[PDB]
Every structure is written in structure tokens, then in C-alpha cells.
């Protein structure tokens, strides 16, 4: 909306907020990120400290599909289990089963206090997840 620009407010105030002195020019410094190592050095170093340099090994032709390992925590397995199905899950009884590929997750990080058992079914697991998941009386079953 053109109505709302302060272009429209300062119609009449000759320099549109750019100042009578120190006039609004063009590129008072360079285009874009020019002088990132010169006259804008104080700026990138304050705000974008790691910006200049090289840090690690290259990975030519990265393929992220093979790398795809999205994670769900134990603390979040209620998102997958039906609330109705999850209603009664004693550790010594029957358990909801939760395929994680179906739900889009690959590894199972063992974050918070799981307490309702489930037979999580996932490609990967944390050291602490399979442990927690067992101590709750559930069980991860490895899949692919």
C-alpha cells in the first residue's frame, strides 16, 4: 500500500529523511558487501564473525537424500501414538506400535521422561533412547 509509506508522509519535507547535509546519494559505500574486509570490517567482525575463511572438509556432490535422518524424541512419541490407542499401555501388557518411517522420522533420540511404553519401530536409536524405552517396558525394534 502506497498510502502507508513514509514516502507519503514526508511529501513536502524536502530531503526524505536523508538529511540536508550528508545528502542521500547512491552507494556511499560499495555495492552489497563491498569492503567487508575494509571499511565495513568493524561490521562483519561484530555481527558476522565467521564470515570470512574456510573451515572444513569439502563434500563434493552432496546428496542429502542418503543423509536424511530426521529425529523424534521419546518425549514426543505421543504425537504418533493415537490418544485413544495410547489410553491403556501398561509395560507388561499390549503396546501401541509406532513405525517411524511412516511418520517421517528416522532416528529416535532418547530425550525426556517417557513413561508410557511403546514399541517404537525405527531405523536408528540413541544409546539412551533404547535404554529408556526398555526401562519403560517398551521396545524399539530395528527397521530400515
Instruction: Output the known binding site.
Output: 17
The residue from 49, 60, 83, 144 that contacts RNA (CB under 7 A) is 60
Under rule CB under 7 A, residue 69 binds RNA = yes
Among residues 99, 144, 104, which one has the least CA distance to residue 118?
99
**Contact mark string toward RNA, 82..101, x via CB under 7 A:** --------------------
Distance CA 51, CA 49 (A): 5
**Contact mark string toward another protein, 19..58, x via CB under 8 A:** ----------x--xx--x---x--xxxxxxxxx-x-xx--
Provide the grid cell at 85.
490407542
Provide the grid cell at 91.
509395560
Stretch near another protein under the rule CB under 8 A, chosen from 3-11, 90-98, 100-108, 126-134: 100-108
Distance CA 7, CA 74 (A): 54
Amino acid at each position: 500500500p502506497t498510502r502507508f509509506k513514509k514516502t507519503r508522509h514526508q511529501r513536502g519535507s524536502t530531503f526524505c529523511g536523508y538529511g540536508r547535509v550528508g545528502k542521500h546519494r547512491k552507494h556511499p559505500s560499495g555495492r552489497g558487501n563491498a569492503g567487508g574486509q575494509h571499511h565495513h570490517r568493524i561490521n562483519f567482525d561484530k555481527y558476522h564473525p565467521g564470515y570470512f575463511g574456510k573451515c572444513g572438509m569439502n563434500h563434493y556432490h552432496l546428496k542429502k537424500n542418503p543423509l536424511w535422518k530426521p529425529t523424534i524424541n521419546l518425549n514426543n512419541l505421543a504425537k504418533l501414538i493415537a490418544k485413544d490407542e495410547a489410553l491403556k499401555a501398561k509395560k507388561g501388557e499390549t503396546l501401541p506400535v509406532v513405525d517411524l518411517l511412516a511418520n517421517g522420522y528416522s532416528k529416535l533420540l532418547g530425550n525426556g521422561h517417557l513413561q508410557t511404553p511403546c514399541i517404537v519401530k525405527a531405523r536408528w536409536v540413541s544409546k539412551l533412547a533404547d535404554k529408556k524405552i526398555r526401562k519403560a517396558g517398551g521396545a524399539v525394534v530395528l527397521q530400515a
